[PDB]
Amino acid sequence: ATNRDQESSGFAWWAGNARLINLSGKLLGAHVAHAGLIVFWAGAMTLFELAHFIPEKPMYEQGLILIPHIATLGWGVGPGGEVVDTFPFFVVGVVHLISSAVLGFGGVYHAIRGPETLEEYSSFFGYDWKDKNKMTTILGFHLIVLGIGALLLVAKAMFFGGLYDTWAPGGGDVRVITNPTLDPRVIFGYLLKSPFGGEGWIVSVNNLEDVVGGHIWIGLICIAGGIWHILTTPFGWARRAFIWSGEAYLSYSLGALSMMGFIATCFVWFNNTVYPSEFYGPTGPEASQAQAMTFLIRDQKLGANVGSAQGPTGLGKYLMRSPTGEIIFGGETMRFWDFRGPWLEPLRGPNGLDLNKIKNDIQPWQERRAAEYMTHAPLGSLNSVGGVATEINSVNFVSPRSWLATSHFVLAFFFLVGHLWHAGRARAAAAGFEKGIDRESEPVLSMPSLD
């Protein structure tokens, strides 16, 4: 039992995994088994969702988060996101669940039976954290792998059925992407967009051509970068900038993951393109706007002239101007005027919401959709009672957008905390005082008084 107590390893049981830092075989084991756990959850959770799935209720009324991910890719769904075949969901679930067995088998093997260290066994699979070239090489393999992944998304979109497109002419539907956006001004133009209202950085991506082209760029970039890191070793400036240790690299990755988590939170909250409202429910903005729409429709049917209706504050009861003059829905939803969705856009002209189109061209499907979305707003309790906080029990509903956003904020935050922890520790340990101050060499004691 090499290194499996505090006295020999220096780490207590509650930090026991830190005993693995220089044990590449067992560490490989931990990693592979963990990957196994992830894939296991994907499979099992998918089969659970499918078992509980009623094809004629919206997905979002049923607590689904993975089936929406599958349906977004174009599998199992048809016009307007209606389920036409549940078999691909079944396939996805079963295949992940079976793969998890292979992964776990490997993980357990390397973890308790295989070589505890790999260096003596193989120069190729062996590594020293402090070997910069080897680090950049493994990094490179993994970048090529990620690039390939992005390219698989591309291949699905272009050659194997396409993607679900909430924006398809005539109504949302599955669509093959034939002309992906390759122009770098567009692609990287997203990257330089402000993250504030009406701009929204990369979260603002609103068409699949841009999504797909973006993935072509990321695929090539990752493969190229992978090759670069396989062929090179870090330059002097990098060498002097970073800490080179396992715990350091881990901390860097924790920072990256935290950042990505906050990003995904905002994506699932605001974006209704790669997270179609057909599957995930309406966004908060969307449902608010939809309320406005619903009452405009009702009151106008009653005979109200909604363009000239002055509300109690002096602002339009139904319609008002944005700070730059565009015609928008009034009331509190004035905040959500940057919202865009296929059910609303046919009412939009060059200056914003168009009064003539409003008076003359609103179709029954728009009324239906606005009602649906208004009454599936992402508000609800921890015990999944749908609606505002004061609503009575009756409707069993918490929006998938809320589950995903909240979960990923919690995770992203704790991951920032973890970054601080491991970065600070990595610094202290590399400098040699992570276990405390040397009584015979206390740095402050050799410093001049502050006063």
Partner: protein, 62 residues
């Protein structure tokens, strides 16, 4: 075919349970590692075969 399916699938579940308990016990057991190792090869191979059998039979029962 349906009965063959049902039996193959039950077989796969049972065998999986057997492997889930036995593989980590064998890996960490001091004595009798040779017979265990052989048995782990046998079990893994049979497991794969059963996955493929259920996979194929799926399309003749659903």
């Amino acid at each position: 075919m349906t009965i063959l399916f049902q039996l193959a699938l039950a077989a796969l579940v049972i065998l999986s349970f057997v492997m889930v308990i036995g593989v980590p016990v064998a890996y960490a057991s001091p004595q009798d590692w040779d017979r265990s190792k052989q048995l782990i090869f046998l079990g893994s191979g049979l497991w794969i075969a059963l996955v493929l059998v259920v996979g194929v039979l799926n399309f003749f029962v659903v």
